[PDB]
Symmetry: none
Subunit: 235 residues, 2 copies
């Protein structure tokens, strides 16, 4: 079984290396958390376009359940979220988790990898999410696919990737990732199904990891059974 | 990686030990293969009940494609076999492979494991193929499931089993098995998909091995593409 530990201040989980150069070489988590809460406040009070996007975001179907989800993920090692295409699972849930950590002064304690079924999706979704936070990829949002990657920043960040990348990484280790999200599970894929076996081993060794599986269809019982009749949350 | 070698005259792949029972325990392959070709040829002449059954087999849709399938498998590490259910994939293909080896003085060079998606199919199929061969289970055919098994003879034989039984075997290795057949791949299943990954690793280290994937008429592209754009035999 592979090695894992929670996020640390002077560890970059995306480049899997100590941080030795730069401000964060010595910054404290409280400092990092406080810093990033303030940078959200500022980006709002300067980018006028951003307030309209957040407004378009409040309107999506999944927003009703922001609390049910955070709570369920926070209390359970594995959680299934399911619901029809168009609710906002893909583009919003990662953000709900991130923002929940930023607002409650916990931004240092959060990094999220999210898998997608295809190269296109890993990239377009990373762009989209960066766009919804008024950024370009590279800051709070990155991606990594075969041959091409714009890694996000070291802290309080989300990296989208193909399953291939994430499997290749699970060899070295996923030190410092707090959340792994497998999106579009309903789409049959071999490596993805294999990824679930590895992730299931990881959870057994490391209860404090958070796994979220996300389906567009009702056929979730196969996965629910595989992860010890874990919670299903409707959206 | 998993250990593997071709079948050897002294080795029983099913009990994973040296052969200490039956005829020609210590003989050469050339000798074992003659014996078995003779034993089959004779059985045909004497069992008139078996001759009715062979005519019944002759009419199955899959019969037509016998040569095409054998040629495809002999020339490729992996093959996929696709066809309407009822067609004869499950009950015949293993026999076509066995009988090709027996008939061309190679009986000793053939041992076939076949996975099924349910314990009951493993057994029911094993028992049916034994019947289409005028035998009880335990000679050219057997099975192995969690808690019960009737193992077949060590040479020129087929064992049916569950995906789990095989995954456990692959931990210790599958030395002496010439063909691995995964049946009913269209039935999505996590462990079955895990198996395919592992089998892909085997094929890379051991191109001499044969993998045969069997499917109802669905979109097999995903499999074809996982196994290096391998053939697809339409049936
Ligand atoms: N790249 C995009 N461009 C414009 N609108 C988008 C884009 N991605 C998502 N959206 C909007 O946000 C909605 C949510 O999609 P998504 O987050 O993928 O939800 P789900 O995962 O539940 O299908 C879409 O229905 C669409 O209206
Ligand atoms: N246990 C059995 N008893 C009698 N006939 C059988 C039995 N199993 C299979 N058959 C016959 O052989 C045919 C093919 O079975 P099978 O090899 O499972 O086809 P496939 O795998 O292509 O769906 C069936 O349509 C049936 O007529
Ligand atoms: C019972 As008989 C003659 O088919 O082996
Ligand atoms: Mn989605
Ligand atoms: Mn079948």
């Amino acid at each position: 079984v592979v090695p894992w530990s929670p996020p640390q201040s002077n560890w970059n989980p995306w480049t899997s290396s100590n941080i030795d150069e730069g401000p964060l070489a010595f910054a404290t988590p409280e400092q990092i958390s406080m810093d990033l809460k303030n940078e959200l406040m500022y980006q709002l009070e300067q980018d006028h376009d951003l307030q309209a996007i957040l407004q378009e975001r409040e309107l999506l179907p999944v927003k009703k359940f922001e609390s049910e989800i955070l709570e369920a993920i926070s209390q359970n090692s594995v959680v299934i979220i399911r619901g029809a295409t168009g609710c906002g699972k893909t583009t919003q849930v990662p953000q709900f988790i991130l923002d929940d950590f930023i607002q409650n002064d916990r931004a240092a304690e959060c990094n999220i990898v999210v898998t997608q079924p295809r190269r296109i999706s890993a990239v377009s979704v990373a762009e989209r999410v960066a766009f919804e936070r008024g950024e370009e990829p590279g800051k709070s949002c990155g991606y990594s696919v075969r041959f091409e990657s714009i890694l996000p920043r070291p802290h309080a960040s989300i990296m989208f990737c193909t399953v291939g990348v994430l499997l290749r990484k699970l060899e070295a280790g996923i030190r410092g990732i707090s959340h792994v999200i497998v999106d579009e599970i309903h789409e049959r894929d071999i490596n993805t199904d294999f990824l679930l076996v590895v992730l299931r081993d990881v959870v057994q060794a490391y209860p404090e990891v958070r796994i979220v599986l996300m389906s567009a269809t009702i056929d979730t019982s196969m996965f629910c059974e595989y992860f010890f009749n874990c919670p299903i949350i409707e959206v």
